[PDB]
Every structure is written in C-alpha cells, then in structure tokens.
A paper describes a structure:
Aminoacyl-tRNA synthetases (aaRSs) charge tRNAs with their cognate amino acid, an essential precursor step to loading of charged tRNAs onto the ribosome and addition of the amino acid to the growing polypeptide chain during protein synthesis. First, the aaRS combines the specific amino acid with adenosine-5′-triphosphate (ATP) to produce an activated aminoacyl-adenylate intermediate which reacts with the appropriate tRNA to produce the aminoacylated tRNA. In general, aaRSs are divided into two classes based on the global fold and sequence conservation. Crystal structures were determined for a CysRS from Borrelia burgdorferi bound to AMP, GluRS from Borrelia burgdorferi and Burkholderia thailandensis bound to glutamic acid, a TrpRS from the eukaryotic pathogen Encephalitozoon cuniculi bound to tryptophan, a HisRS from Burkholderia thailandensis bound to histidine, and a LysRS from Burkholderia thailandensis bound to lysine.
Author numbering: 1 to 72, 92 to 165, 183 to 198, 204 to 275, 286 to 469
Write the structure that this text describes.
C-alpha cells in the first residue's frame, strides 16, 4: 500500500512509490527553554508519519535538526540541557527517536560552503553587516506560499564587530534558514524526499530553505513538504500536564483523535475526555486479556499479522486504507473502538488488532494491560486450580519445560507462583 499525503508544494496529495529508501527531514526545536505541548503536537505528527511509512513497509531514514545557536553559563550547557529534556519529553510521548540528529553548531562548514557557492552564482550580497540571499535572482521564490533590496530577501550569515565563527564574510553565525538547508544537503545530499514542519514555516522558513537548496543544487529539491496545523489554547509543558495529574499519553491520545491538518482546540476538558477514553480502552482490553487460555495467549506473543481469521485481515486492511490516505490515524482509532465493541470478533482477535494498531497509536497497550491486571485481586477459579496441578505434576515428572510454560502463562497475567 502506497502512502498518499497532502503536499503543500502542489496543493494535492502526493503518491509515494519509492519503498526502498525514503528520506525525511523535520525542523526540530529551539533549545533555550522547555518545549511546550504545541511543539509536541507537531512532533507527534512527524512520529505518526514515520511510523505509518514503516508500518506500510517503507524503509525510512529520518533526520531532525536541533537549533542550538542564539535566538532572534555556556550557551552550549544551556542548549545541551534543553536538548536532553526535549528528547526526554519525546520518550514520555512515545515519539520515535530520529535516525540522525543534526546539531546546528556541528555543521558550520557545509553552511559556509553553501554560501560560497551562492555567492559565486551572484545571488548574494552583503548589507548592514549581513550576507543576504537576493530573492529576485530567483523568479520561482515562494510559489509554495502564494537595508534589503527586496522585502522578502533573507539573511544567510550574520556578522558583527564584537557563539561566533570565522568565514569569508567575517566572524558571525548562520540564519536558521541556512542551517536547515545546508544540513539537509550534507546529510541527505541532493535528495530529500519529505520535509516536515508546522504551517507557520510555509510563508517564510520553508520557502527560504527551498530557495537556498535549489539554487545550490541547480535543480529540483525535495518534492514533498508536509505541514501540521497549530494547537490552540485559550503555553503548557509536559511537566505542567503531569503536575495537574495528567499522563503524557493523555495528550498523545488527544493528538490522535484529530487529523494533522486540523487545528486542535486544546483544553483541560478535552484532555480529560482523552484521559477517560484512554482509560476505558485499557480496561476493556484488560478484561479481554484476563479472560484468555494458554493457546489464545501464546498466539499474541507470536507473529501478530499472521491472521487466524479472514475477519481480522478485513479489519487490518480497513485500517491500512485509513492511515494510507493522508495519515488518517483518527479514523484508525475510531476503527479500533468499532472493533473493541464488535460481536463478530473473539476476545483474542480484538487484542491482536489492538496490538497491531498500537504500532501506530503507541499507547503502551501491552504493558498498560499488564499494569492494570497486576492491581486486581487474586481469585483462583477452577481453570487456575488445574493448571497448578498440571504444573505440580509436570515438576514431579521432571518436565521443567511444561512447568515453566505454565509459570510463564501466569506471569503474563500478572501472577507469580510461590
Ligand atoms: N501551537 C503550535 N501548534 C503546533 N505546532 C507548533 C506550535 N507552535 C510551534 N509549533 C511547531 O513546533 C516546531 C518547533 O517550534 P519552535 O521551537 O517554537 O520553533 C515547529 O515545527 C513549529 O511549527
Ligand atoms: Zn527548519
């Protein structure tokens, strides 16, 4: 199945036919303070996307920059501290770690080498202490969106008389536009496939990257640009959300029930609905899982997408169809709830689909079911009294394999045997 996504460059869905090696760049955070949940809506978006490509069978190499420069103790200690915390918040929200993290301060050579090239193509100029890119040397500029020579000219390199680097234009630092563009060009070379960000990058930052890269390359760069819509509040960090007694994954759930091209109206009340819906999901799945016999239970340890019933495959394909049309994970979730409540599926089938959909949803369902069950009370009914005999016998016949298999059945339901 081919992923179809909404491409801002062309205002229609682009088809993604190249399964062998798709390259994805996402603008990363500023690292001068904790990121807020608005930033994480967008990172959950990148996550949903890479996870969907992978789920659909694409091999993805995904890169993210970290801007650790000087917004517009050691500056490095600070940005190092808020770098670890960002990725710590990421782990709390089950956001896949990029395959490559490109740190602006570690890639100044390529940035300088891209300016050198642009200057030799007569595209640049120096004014008021800065090297500017001259956008009129470039008829196409900004078609994706709609002391300077032109309003929309942009800085490439900042200089000053007194974090700083030497250059052919003097000591200075790059603009954020040149960091994103140059780093892509070094890491992915002439060949980005999908470039992500928030909608606010449409009208300045992304078109600026494009200008840099396509003038450098002297050709088409990066066919697909995908943008996520804003999270709107009446800004909040994850700590704030933990401190008000929410769980990170509650915000995750909330991000899941809304397509990436919609604005998300955030509130405590909608976060609360998400917390309850996520809580019921886990409780319902826990009842299903508690109720299993050894043969059904072993089946979920195994190859999940090896379906035992056509009706599972049906729901799997209905799922694929949904996510493959433009990252519609919200309809995926909707589908899981149809599945949970369904009377044409056994308990074991519902869990299989849960565990498969969770490869995208990333709610820790498996491990949330084990935690939920470890908190109910012990009730030894007959079917349990008998596995123990089966076990006490097997441990006497000295068939420790069977004994350990029984043991490992109780453990997966949260029981220990002493
Ligand atoms: N309220 C918001 N909702 C969704 N994404 C946002 C919001 N604010 C910032 N972003 C995105 O978060 C990423 C980094 O944000 P910043 O570090 O503030 O530049 C960018 O991709 C932004 O477009
Ligand atoms: Zn960027």
């Amino acid at each position: 199945m081919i992923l179809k996504l909404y491409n801002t460059r062309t205002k229609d869905f682009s088809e993604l036919t190249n399964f062998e090696n798709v390259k994805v760049y996402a603008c990363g955070p500023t690292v001068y303070n904790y990121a807020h949940i608005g930033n994480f809506r967008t990172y959950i978006f990148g996550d949903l996307l890479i996870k969907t490509l992978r789920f659909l069978g694409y091999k993805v190499n995904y890169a993210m920059n970290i801007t650790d420069i000087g917004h517009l103790l050691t500056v490095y200690e600070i940005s190092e501290f808020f770098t670890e915390a960002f990725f710590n918040d990421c782990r709390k929200l089950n956001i896949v770690y990029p395959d490559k993290v490109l740190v602006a301060s570690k890639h100044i050579p390529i940035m300088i080498e891209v300016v050198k090239i642009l200057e030799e193509k007569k595209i640049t100029y120096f004014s008021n202490g800065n090297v500017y890119f001259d956008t009129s040397c470039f008829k196409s500029y900004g078609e994706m969106a709609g002391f300077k020579r032109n309003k929309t000219d942009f800085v490439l390199w900042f200089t000053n008389s007194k974090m700083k680097w030497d250059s052919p234009w003097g000591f200075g630092y790059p603009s954020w536009h040149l960091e994103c563009a140059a780093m892509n060009l070094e890491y992915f070379k002439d060949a980005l496939d999908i470039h992500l960000g928030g909608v606010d990058h449409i009208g300045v930052h992304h078109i600026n990257e494009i200008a840099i890269a396509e003038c450098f390359l002297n050709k088409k760069w990066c066919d697909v640009f995908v943008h996520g819509e804003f999270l709107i509040m009446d800004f909040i960090t994850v700590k704030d959300l933990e401190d008000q007694n929410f769980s990170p994954l509650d915000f995750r759930y909330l991000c899941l029930t809304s397509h990436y091209r919609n604005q998300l109206k955030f509130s405590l009340d909608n976060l609360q609905a998400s917390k309850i819906a996520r809580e019921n999901l886990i409780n319902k799945l826990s009842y299903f899982y508690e109720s299993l016999d050894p043969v059904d239970l072993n089946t979920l340890n195994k190859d999940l997408k090896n379906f035992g019933f056509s009706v599972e495959k049906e729901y799997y394909d209905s799922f694929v169809e949904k996510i493959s049309f433009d990252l519609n994970v919200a309809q995926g979730l909707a589908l899981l709830w149809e599945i949970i409540k369904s009377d044409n599926l056994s308990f074991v089938s519902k869990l299989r689909l849960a565990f498969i959909f969770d490869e995208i949803m990333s709610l820790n369902l498996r491990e949330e079911i084990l935690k939920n069950l470890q908190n109910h009370d012990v009730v030894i009914d007959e079917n349990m009294k008998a596995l123990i005999e089966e076990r006490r016998i097997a441990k006497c016949e000295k068939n420790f394999k069977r004994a350990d298999e029984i043991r490992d059945f109780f453990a997966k339901k949260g029981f220990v045997l002493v």
